[PDB]
mmCIF file of all heavy atoms in Angstrom:
data_model
loop_
_atom_site.group_PDB
_atom_site.id
_atom_site.type_symbol
_atom_site.label_atom_id
_atom_site.label_comp_id
_atom_site.label_asym_id
_atom_site.label_seq_id
_atom_site.Cartn_x
_atom_site.Cartn_y
_atom_site.Cartn_z
ATOM 1 N N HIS A 8 56.753 75.206 -51.001
ATOM 2 C CA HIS A 8 56.767 74.455 -49.743
ATOM 3 C C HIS A 8 55.678 75.009 -48.815
ATOM 4 O O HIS A 8 55.883 76.009 -48.130
ATOM 5 C CB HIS A 8 58.137 74.555 -49.088
ATOM 6 C CG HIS A 8 58.280 73.733 -47.840
ATOM 7 N ND1 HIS A 8 59.504 73.307 -47.370
ATOM 8 C CD2 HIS A 8 57.368 73.258 -46.966
ATOM 9 C CE1 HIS A 8 59.332 72.615 -46.267
ATOM 10 N NE2 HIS A 8 58.038 72.575 -45.990
ATOM 11 N N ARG A 9 54.522 74.377 -48.855
ATOM 12 C CA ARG A 9 53.396 74.835 -48.058
ATOM 13 C C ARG A 9 53.490 74.467 -46.564
ATOM 14 O O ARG A 9 53.664 73.328 -46.210
ATOM 15 C CB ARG A 9 52.104 74.317 -48.656
ATOM 16 C CG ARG A 9 50.933 74.663 -47.855
ATOM 17 C CD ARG A 9 50.177 75.898 -48.266
ATOM 18 N NE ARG A 9 48.759 75.749 -47.891
ATOM 19 C CZ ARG A 9 47.754 75.411 -48.734
ATOM 20 N NH1 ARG A 9 47.959 75.181 -50.044
ATOM 21 N NH2 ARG A 9 46.528 75.302 -48.239
ATOM 22 N N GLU A 10 53.365 75.472 -45.717
ATOM 23 C CA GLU A 10 53.487 75.269 -44.268
ATOM 24 C C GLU A 10 52.678 76.392 -43.569
ATOM 25 O O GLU A 10 53.242 77.431 -43.245
ATOM 26 C CB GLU A 10 54.940 75.440 -43.835
ATOM 27 C CG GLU A 10 55.401 74.659 -42.600
ATOM 28 C CD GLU A 10 54.491 74.772 -41.354
ATOM 29 O OE1 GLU A 10 53.242 74.680 -41.499
ATOM 30 O OE2 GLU A 10 55.024 74.871 -40.229
ATOM 31 N N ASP A 11 51.401 76.120 -43.290
ATOM 32 C CA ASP A 11 50.546 77.054 -42.591
ATOM 33 C C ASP A 11 50.878 77.339 -41.125
ATOM 34 O O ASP A 11 50.294 78.228 -40.524
ATOM 35 C CB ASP A 11 49.115 76.655 -42.726
ATOM 36 C CG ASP A 11 48.609 76.847 -44.128
ATOM 37 O OD1 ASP A 11 49.427 77.212 -44.994
ATOM 38 O OD2 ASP A 11 47.416 76.629 -44.445
ATOM 39 N N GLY A 12 51.870 76.641 -40.603
ATOM 40 C CA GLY A 12 52.329 76.886 -39.253
ATOM 41 C C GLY A 12 53.203 78.129 -39.121
ATOM 42 O O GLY A 12 53.348 78.668 -38.018
ATOM 43 N N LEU A 13 53.796 78.617 -40.212
ATOM 44 C CA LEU A 13 54.632 79.827 -40.178
ATOM 45 C C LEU A 13 53.649 80.983 -40.330
ATOM 46 O O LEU A 13 52.578 80.779 -40.874
ATOM 47 C CB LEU A 13 55.653 79.741 -41.328
ATOM 48 C CG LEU A 13 56.362 78.380 -41.363
ATOM 49 C CD1 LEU A 13 57.490 78.324 -42.332
ATOM 50 C CD2 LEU A 13 56.895 77.950 -40.014
ATOM 51 N N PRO A 14 53.933 82.159 -39.782
ATOM 52 C CA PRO A 14 52.928 83.242 -39.840
ATOM 53 C C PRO A 14 53.090 84.200 -41.002
ATOM 54 O O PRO A 14 52.171 84.981 -41.195
ATOM 55 C CB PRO A 14 53.116 83.958 -38.497
ATOM 56 C CG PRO A 14 54.435 83.407 -37.943
ATOM 57 C CD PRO A 14 55.128 82.580 -39.001
ATOM 58 N N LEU A 15 54.213 84.237 -41.690
ATOM 59 C CA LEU A 15 54.307 85.097 -42.877
ATOM 60 C C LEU A 15 54.890 84.290 -44.032
ATOM 61 O O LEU A 15 55.738 83.420 -43.813
ATOM 62 C CB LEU A 15 55.184 86.350 -42.674
ATOM 63 C CG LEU A 15 54.782 87.373 -41.609
ATOM 64 C CD1 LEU A 15 55.792 88.400 -41.486
ATOM 65 C CD2 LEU A 15 53.440 87.944 -41.897
ATOM 66 N N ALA A 16 54.411 84.560 -45.243
ATOM 67 C CA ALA A 16 54.860 83.833 -46.392
ATOM 68 C C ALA A 16 56.064 84.477 -47.001
ATOM 69 O O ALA A 16 56.141 85.678 -47.059
ATOM 70 C CB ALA A 16 53.785 83.745 -47.402
ATOM 71 N N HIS A 17 56.989 83.650 -47.469
ATOM 72 C CA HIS A 17 58.138 84.151 -48.226
ATOM 73 C C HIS A 17 57.963 83.700 -49.664
ATOM 74 O O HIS A 17 57.599 82.536 -49.936
ATOM 75 C CB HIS A 17 59.431 83.588 -47.706
ATOM 76 C CG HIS A 17 59.999 84.345 -46.571
ATOM 77 N ND1 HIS A 17 59.322 84.463 -45.376
ATOM 78 C CD2 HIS A 17 61.153 85.026 -46.435
ATOM 79 C CE1 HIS A 17 60.040 85.233 -44.571
ATOM 80 N NE2 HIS A 17 61.168 85.543 -45.176
ATOM 81 N N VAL A 18 58.189 84.615 -50.599
ATOM 82 C CA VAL A 18 58.051 84.315 -52.022
ATOM 83 C C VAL A 18 59.266 84.921 -52.750
ATOM 84 O O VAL A 18 59.670 86.030 -52.439
ATOM 85 C CB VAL A 18 56.774 84.995 -52.587
ATOM 86 C CG1 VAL A 18 56.612 84.706 -54.028
ATOM 87 C CG2 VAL A 18 55.537 84.571 -51.842
ATOM 88 N N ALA A 19 59.833 84.190 -53.692
ATOM 89 C CA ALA A 19 60.983 84.663 -54.457
ATOM 90 C C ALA A 19 60.821 84.266 -55.901
ATOM 91 O O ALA A 19 60.846 83.063 -56.264
ATOM 92 C CB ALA A 19 62.254 84.151 -53.899
ATOM 93 N N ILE A 20 60.609 85.274 -56.749
ATOM 94 C CA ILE A 20 60.464 85.064 -58.178
ATOM 95 C C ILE A 20 61.612 85.710 -58.936
ATOM 96 O O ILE A 20 62.134 86.752 -58.540
ATOM 97 C CB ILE A 20 59.095 85.606 -58.647
ATOM 98 C CG1 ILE A 20 58.918 85.394 -60.156
ATOM 99 C CG2 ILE A 20 58.955 87.060 -58.273
ATOM 100 C CD1 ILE A 20 57.665 85.930 -60.732
ATOM 101 N N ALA A 21 62.052 85.060 -60.021
ATOM 102 C CA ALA A 21 63.110 85.616 -60.833
ATOM 103 C C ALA A 21 63.133 85.035 -62.252
ATOM 104 O O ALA A 21 62.654 83.902 -62.481
ATOM 105 C CB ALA A 21 64.449 85.388 -60.177
ATOM 106 N N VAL A 22 63.675 85.805 -63.178
ATOM 107 C CA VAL A 22 63.886 85.320 -64.561
ATOM 108 C C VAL A 22 65.376 85.087 -64.714
ATOM 109 O O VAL A 22 66.157 85.416 -63.839
ATOM 110 C CB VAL A 22 63.422 86.337 -65.608
ATOM 111 C CG1 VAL A 22 61.905 86.460 -65.588
ATOM 112 C CG2 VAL A 22 64.124 87.730 -65.397
ATOM 113 N N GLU A 23 65.801 84.479 -65.804
ATOM 114 C CA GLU A 23 67.212 84.239 -65.960
ATOM 115 C C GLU A 23 68.026 85.480 -66.339
ATOM 116 O O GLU A 23 67.763 86.147 -67.361
ATOM 117 C CB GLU A 23 67.436 83.159 -66.975
ATOM 118 C CG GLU A 23 68.882 82.755 -67.155
ATOM 119 C CD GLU A 23 69.056 81.843 -68.318
ATOM 120 O OE1 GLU A 23 68.023 81.474 -68.936
ATOM 121 O OE2 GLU A 23 70.207 81.480 -68.620
ATOM 122 N N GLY A 24 69.061 85.752 -65.540
ATOM 123 C CA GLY A 24 69.926 86.886 -65.758
ATOM 124 C C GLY A 24 71.129 86.509 -66.601
ATOM 125 O O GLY A 24 71.516 85.353 -66.642
ATOM 126 N N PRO A 25 71.766 87.500 -67.189
ATOM 127 C CA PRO A 25 72.880 87.257 -68.129
ATOM 128 C C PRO A 25 74.147 86.772 -67.507
ATOM 129 O O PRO A 25 74.882 86.063 -68.189
ATOM 130 C CB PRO A 25 73.174 88.634 -68.707
ATOM 131 C CG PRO A 25 72.475 89.591 -67.889
ATOM 132 C CD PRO A 25 71.518 88.925 -66.961
ATOM 133 N N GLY A 26 74.484 87.229 -66.313
ATOM 134 C CA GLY A 26 75.727 86.838 -65.685
ATOM 135 C C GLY A 26 76.763 87.925 -65.613
ATOM 136 O O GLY A 26 76.717 88.895 -66.346
ATOM 137 N N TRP A 27 77.680 87.751 -64.671
ATOM 138 C CA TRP A 27 78.770 88.694 -64.400
ATOM 139 C C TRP A 27 79.175 89.686 -65.470
ATOM 140 O O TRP A 27 78.968 90.889 -65.324
ATOM 141 C CB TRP A 27 80.047 87.924 -63.988
ATOM 142 C CG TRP A 27 79.939 87.255 -62.684
ATOM 143 C CD1 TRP A 27 79.878 85.924 -62.446
ATOM 144 C CD2 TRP A 27 79.854 87.892 -61.394
ATOM 145 N NE1 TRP A 27 79.758 85.690 -61.092
ATOM 146 C CE2 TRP A 27 79.759 86.868 -60.427
ATOM 147 C CE3 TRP A 27 79.861 89.240 -60.956
ATOM 148 C CZ2 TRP A 27 79.654 87.140 -59.043
ATOM 149 C CZ3 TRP A 27 79.753 89.504 -59.580
ATOM 150 C CH2 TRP A 27 79.656 88.452 -58.650
ATOM 151 N N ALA A 28 79.766 89.163 -66.535
ATOM 152 C CA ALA A 28 80.394 90.004 -67.542
ATOM 153 C C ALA A 28 79.528 90.881 -68.435
ATOM 154 O O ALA A 28 80.032 91.857 -68.991
ATOM 155 C CB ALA A 28 81.345 89.191 -68.372
ATOM 156 N N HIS A 29 78.260 90.511 -68.580
ATOM 157 C CA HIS A 29 77.335 91.202 -69.492
ATOM 158 C C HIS A 29 77.092 92.677 -69.132
ATOM 159 O O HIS A 29 76.578 92.959 -68.058
ATOM 160 C CB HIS A 29 76.016 90.443 -69.506
ATOM 161 C CG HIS A 29 75.339 90.424 -70.829
ATOM 162 N ND1 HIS A 29 75.162 91.541 -71.607
ATOM 163 C CD2 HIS A 29 74.794 89.399 -71.513
ATOM 164 C CE1 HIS A 29 74.528 91.215 -72.702
ATOM 165 N NE2 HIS A 29 74.274 89.921 -72.684
ATOM 166 N N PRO A 30 77.401 93.586 -70.067
ATOM 167 C CA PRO A 30 77.239 95.050 -69.843
ATOM 168 C C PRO A 30 75.815 95.429 -69.486
ATOM 169 O O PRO A 30 75.578 96.440 -68.812
ATOM 170 C CB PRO A 30 77.559 95.669 -71.217
ATOM 171 C CG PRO A 30 78.343 94.619 -71.936
ATOM 172 C CD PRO A 30 77.877 93.287 -71.418
ATOM 173 N N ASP A 31 74.878 94.599 -69.929
ATOM 174 C CA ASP A 31 73.447 94.686 -69.675
ATOM 175 C C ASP A 31 73.100 94.775 -68.196
ATOM 176 O O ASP A 31 71.960 95.132 -67.847
ATOM 177 C CB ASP A 31 72.776 93.388 -70.186
ATOM 178 C CG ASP A 31 72.202 93.513 -71.585
ATOM 179 O OD1 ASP A 31 72.500 94.431 -72.391
ATOM 180 O OD2 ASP A 31 71.389 92.659 -71.952
ATOM 181 N N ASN A 32 74.039 94.393 -67.347
ATOM 182 C CA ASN A 32 73.836 94.367 -65.902
ATOM 183 C C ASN A 32 73.574 95.732 -65.337
ATOM 184 O O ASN A 32 72.772 95.873 -64.429
ATOM 185 C CB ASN A 32 75.001 93.699 -65.171
ATOM 186 C CG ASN A 32 74.790 92.197 -65.034
ATOM 187 O OD1 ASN A 32 73.705 91.746 -64.690
ATOM 188 N ND2 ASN A 32 75.837 91.436 -65.346
ATOM 189 N N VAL A 33 74.256 96.743 -65.875
ATOM 190 C CA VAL A 33 74.085 98.104 -65.368
ATOM 191 C C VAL A 33 72.635 98.535 -65.524
ATOM 192 O O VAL A 33 71.995 98.891 -64.531
ATOM 193 C CB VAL A 33 75.046 99.077 -66.014
ATOM 194 C CG1 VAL A 33 74.891 100.466 -65.383
ATOM 195 C CG2 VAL A 33 76.470 98.587 -65.862
ATOM 196 N N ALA A 34 72.083 98.432 -66.749
ATOM 197 C CA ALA A 34 70.691 98.831 -66.993
ATOM 198 C C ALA A 34 69.730 98.046 -66.127
ATOM 199 O O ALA A 34 68.736 98.612 -65.577
ATOM 200 C CB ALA A 34 70.362 98.669 -68.432
#
């Protein structure tokens, strides 16, 4: 969402996570 009127950019990147129950969450 491009908007040069705001003075700082917000960026949020992520990959798909396993979900609640997965033991992998700790690591």
Side-chain angles (χ1 to χ4, degrees):
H8 184 156
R9 176 97 151 258
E10 209 312 45
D11 289 5
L13 312 188
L15 299 175
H17 275 62
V18 180
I20 180 182
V22 291
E23 184 189 356
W27 292 111
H29 216 312
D31 264 16
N32 272 315
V33 184

